[PDB]
Ligand binder design. Structure first.
Ligand SMILES: [Zn+2]
Ligand SMILES: [Zn+2]
Lengths: 48, 383, 81, 389
C-alpha cells in the first residue's frame, strides 16, 4: 500500500491526520513526503 | 582509507564494533564513519555503493531487504581492505538464515549461533550500563528477548534511564550519558532469571542442559510455544529442574486429555489431533539434530517405548502424507515415489489425504531416513 | 555500423566544467488539470496543509543536496580528484 | 519364545550379534535360530510375516529392498518382546539413508555413523581371526573397504585361508576352515595402520579429529581425487601437512584450468574452473563446515581470494542448478529469491520472468555473498573455517 495512487486514495485521510493539532507519526509524514515529491515531479494521475 | 581495530572481542555487537572503530581512528561520531566507509566503497568500485547503511540502527544484514548480499560483500571488503590487521567483522553481523524454528518462524544467525526471529528486539534494545562502562563494548546478547539480566553482573538490563526516557548504545556512544541530561546512566525472582540469562550465553547452569548455544534459544522459543506467551524464567528453570520427569508428565497430560476430549473415534484419530502441538512444535528447532534437539529426542524416545501399548493406539495414528514429509525430511515427490514403490502402506488404495499411520512411518524413518544427527542412537542411550 | 562513442578528457586539459540550470517553481500548488473540481480542492488543500504542518524544508533540502553535491554528475565522479 | 543376550557389544555386526545369541540360548546353528524367530513372528500378527529373511547375510535392512520398514518393525518387536533385558538390536543394523555423499552416491547408517555405500564390501567380507578368536564377535568395520587393518592388533584383515573364502556369517565366529577342519592360524603397513585405526573413532595425529562419520566422507573424497585405488600412504601424506597440501592441490588445479581454459575469462564458469573440487566436496556426508574439513578449507581459500585479479574468482559464472547445491534451496526457492531481486541475474529476461534454470546467469562471488547472508545455516557456517589454521 506504499505506491503513489494508493496513498493518493487516502488523501482525505491525510487531510484530517494533518489537521489535528497533534503531530502525526513519522511513517505518515514519510508517506506524505513521498506524495508531495511525486506531485513535484508532476505527471498524469488518470484512469481512462 | 586505513584504520586500526581495537582489541577485538568475541561477543560484541556489530554496531558496538563500528562505534568503537569510529571513535578510535579519526571520527567524532559514528555516523560520520558510516559516510566515510560509504565514500570508500564509492572509491573502490562496488555494489554497496548504493545500499550501504549510514544510520547505525540498520547495519546488520537482516535489516536490508534484497541487499543483504551486498552488505555482506561490503563487510568482506572492509575486513580485508581497510585495517592494519584484518578483523573478524563479518562474524559479528546478525544476518538472516534459511533454517526455521519449529512452528513457521524464521531465524537469524550470528557467528556460529542461530537465534529465532521471534525474539530479536526490533527496537528499544537494553544495555548493561555497568558492562558498558567497564568493557567499553555492547554485547550482542542484549538484542534478544531472553537475555534479561547481565550474565556477568546479575543486574537487570537498563532499557530506560531517568535522564533518557529510553536509551540505546546505538545512539549513546558506548558511554554512560543519557540523551537529554549529560550524566552517568548507571542506575541499579532475580536469580530465577539470572541463571537463564547466563545459560543463554555459552555457559552452564545446573538445571538447564548443555546444548549448543544455538539450541538454547530453541528451548526458549519452544517454551514460549507451550506458555502461549510471556517467557518467564522461573517456570523454565523449574521445568528443567525435573527434566525427564516434567516433560514426560507434560506429554502424558496433553496426550491423555486429547484422547478423552477427542470428538472422533480411535481408528480415524489423527496425530495432529493427538500429540498435535508438541510433536510438530518441536520437530524443527535449530534443526532435528536429536543429540542437541533434546525436546524432539525425549518425545521420540517416549513415543518409541509406548509405540504398542493400547492396541497400538499411538502406532495407528493417521498422519497425512504432508506430515510424513515433516516427520522425516523428504518431498511429497519422494514419499510418492516410496509408496508407488510399495515402501509405505497407503491403507486404502487408489495425495494430501490422511492415508498413513504413525508406526509404519516411524519404522520407515528408522529404516530409510535415519540421518547422521537425525539419528535414533542419540536418544535411546539417554536417561 | 554499431557506432560506439568515446568521450575522454583531452590530454592537456586542466579540468572540466559542467554547467546547467535548474528552476524550482510553484507549479505544484494547483493541479494542471482536474476534470472534477471536487478532487482539485482536496489536493490544493493537501498541499496547503502539508506546507503549514510540515514545512517544505525536508523536500527542499533533499533536492538542494542533490543539486549542491555532484549527483547530477551521475558517474563522472567515480574517479575524480 | 524367550531369549537372553551375552555381553552386548556396541561395535559389532548385526549378524555377529545374532550368531552369539543363537549359540547362547538353544540353537546350535543360526539358520534354525532365525527360522525360529520367523515362526515366532508368524504366530504374532506382523508384516514381516512374509518378507523376513532366513539368510544371515541379507538381514541388514540395506539388503532389504522395498521391505526395510517391515524388518525394522520386526527388530523393535524383538527388542521388546523376546529378551530379559531389551537388546540394542536396531542400533547395529546398517541400513539405507536418504542422505547422499558428494557425487551422487547413497549412504548407509549404522548406529550414529553414516558411511558411503561405495565402500561397503558387497561380498567377501574379511575377518581378523585373532580378533575373532579373542573376542568372539565380528565388528562392523570389517564390512567397510577402509578397515583393512585391525586397529586392535596391527594385523591386516584376512579374507581367505589356505578355507579359500572365509566369512564369519558362514563360519560361525570360530577358527575353523571351509573345506578343512583346523584353525585359521596365519598372520606400506604402518601407513595403513594409522588410517585403519583412525577410521574407528580414535586419534591418529596426522589425521583430523573429525566425527567418525565425516572420516568415511574424507576417504570417499580421496577416492574421488585419485579416480580409484584408495591407498593409505597418499592419504596420510596429504594430511601430514594439511593446511599446505590441499592448498597446493587447489592452487594447481585452479591454475591448470585457468591456463587451459577454452573460454575467455569474462565467460569462464565455475563448473570448469574449480569444478571437480568444489562440487566434489560440497556434501561429503553433509556440509557441516566444522567437520566437512575440505569444503571448509576450499571455502576459506576461495573467500581469501574472492577479489584478487579484477575479480577472477568473484566473477565466475554459476548456474541456478549450481546455486541450489552451493547453498541448500530448491530452484523454486531460487526463483523466489530472484523475483525478490535478492539475486543479480546479470542478463535481462524481460517478459514475465521465464525462469531458465540451466543458463549460466549468476556470479559466484554474488552467490558466495548470498550464502553469507540469507543461507548461513546452523553448522554450514562461515565462522567455522575462518577461525582455523
Ligand atoms: Zn554487564
Ligand atoms: Zn583383531
Amino acid at each position: 500500500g506504499k505506491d503513489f495512487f494508493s496513498i493518493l486514495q487516502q488523501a482525505e485521510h491525510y487531510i484530517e491526520v494533518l489537521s489535528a493539532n497533534k503531530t502525526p507519526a513519522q511513517e505518515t509524514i514519510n508517506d506524505m513526503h513521498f506524495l508531495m515529491a511525486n506531485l513535484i515531479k508532476g505527471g498524469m494521475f488518470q484512469h481512462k | 582509507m586505513f584504520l586500526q581495530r581495537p582489541k577485538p572481542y568475541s561477543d560484541e555487537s556489530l554496531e558496538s564494533f563500528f562505534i568503537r572503530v569510529a571513535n578510535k581512528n579519526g571520527y567524532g561520531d559514528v555516523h560520520r564513519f558510516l559516510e566515510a566507509t560509504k565514500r570508500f566503497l564509492q572509491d573502490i568500485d562496488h555494489n554497496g555503493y548504493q545500499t550501504f547503511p549510514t544510520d547505525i540502527t540498520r547495519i546488520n544484514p537482516y535489516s536490508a531487504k534484497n541487499s543483504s548480499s551486498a552488505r555482506t560483500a561490503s563487510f568482506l571488503k572492509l575486513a580485508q581492505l581497510t585495517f592494519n590487521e584484518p578483523p573478524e567483522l563479518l562474524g559479528l553481523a546478525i544476518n538472516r538464515t534459511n533454517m526455521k524454528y519449529s512452528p513457521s518462524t524464521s531465524a537469524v544467525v550470528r557467528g556460529a549461533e542461530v537465534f529465532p526471529r521471534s525474539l530479536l528486539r526490533t527496537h528499544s534494545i537494553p544495555c548493561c550500563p555497568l558492562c558498558l562502562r567497564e568493557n567499553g563494548y555492547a554485547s550482542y546478547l542484549w538484542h534478544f528477548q531472553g537475555y534479561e539480566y547481565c550474565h556477568s553482573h546479575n543486574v537487570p538490563l537498563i532499557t530506560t534511564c531517568s535522564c533518557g526516557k529510553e536509551f540505546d548504545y546505538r545512539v549513546s556512544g558506548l558511554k554512560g550519558i543519557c540523551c537529554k541530561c549529560k550524566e552517568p546512566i548507571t542506575l541499579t525472582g532475580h536469580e530465577a532469571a539470572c541463571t537463564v540469562s547466563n545459560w543463554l550465553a555459552g555457559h552452564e547452569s545446573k538445571p538447564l542442559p548443555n546444548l549448543p548455544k544455538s539450541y538454547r534459544w530453541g528451548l526458549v522459543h519452544w517454551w514460549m510455544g507451550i506458555k502461549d506467551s510471556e517467557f518467564d524464567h522461573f517456570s523454565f528453570v523449574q521445568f528443567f529442574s525435573n527434566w525427564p520427569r516434567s516433560f514426560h508428565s507434560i506429554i502424558e497430560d496433553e496426550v491423555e486429555f486429547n484422547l478423552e476430549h477427542a470428538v472422533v473415534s480411535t481408528s480415524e484419530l489423527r496425530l495432529k489431533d493427538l500429540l498435535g502441538r508438541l510433536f510438530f512444535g518441536s520437530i524443527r528447532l535449530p534443526e532435528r539434530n536429536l543429540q542437541h534437539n533434546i525436546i524432539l529426542g525425549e518425545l521420540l524416545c517416549y513415543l518409541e517405548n509406548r509405540l504398542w501399548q493400547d492396541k497400538g493406539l499411538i502406532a495407528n495414528l493417521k498422519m497425512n502424507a504432508l506430515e510424513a514429509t515433516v516427520m522425516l525430511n523428504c518431498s511429497l515427490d519422494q514419499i510418492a515415489s516410496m509408496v508407488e514403490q510399495r515402501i509405505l502402506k497407503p491403507n486404502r488404495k487408489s495425495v494430501t489425504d490422511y492415508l498413513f499411520h504413525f508406526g509404519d512411518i516411524f519404522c520407515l524413518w528408522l529404516a530409510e531416513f535415519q540421518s547422521d544427527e537425525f539419528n535414533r542412537s542419540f536418544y535411546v542411550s539417554r536417561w | 555500423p554499431h557506432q560506439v562513442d568515446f568521450c575522454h578528457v583531452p590530454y592537456g586539459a586542466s579540468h572540466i566544467e559542467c554547467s546547467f540550470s535548474v528552476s524550482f517553481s510553484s507549479e505544484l500548488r494547483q493541479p494542471y488539470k482536474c476534470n472534477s473540481s471536487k478532487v482539485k480542492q482536496t489536493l490544493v488543500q493537501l498541499v496547503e496543509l502539508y506546507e503549514t504542518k510540515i514545512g517544505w524544508t525536508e523536500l527542499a533540502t533533499r533536492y538542494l543536496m542533490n543539486i549542491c553535491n555532484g549527483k547530477w554528475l551521475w558517474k563522472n565522479t567515480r574517479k575524480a580528484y
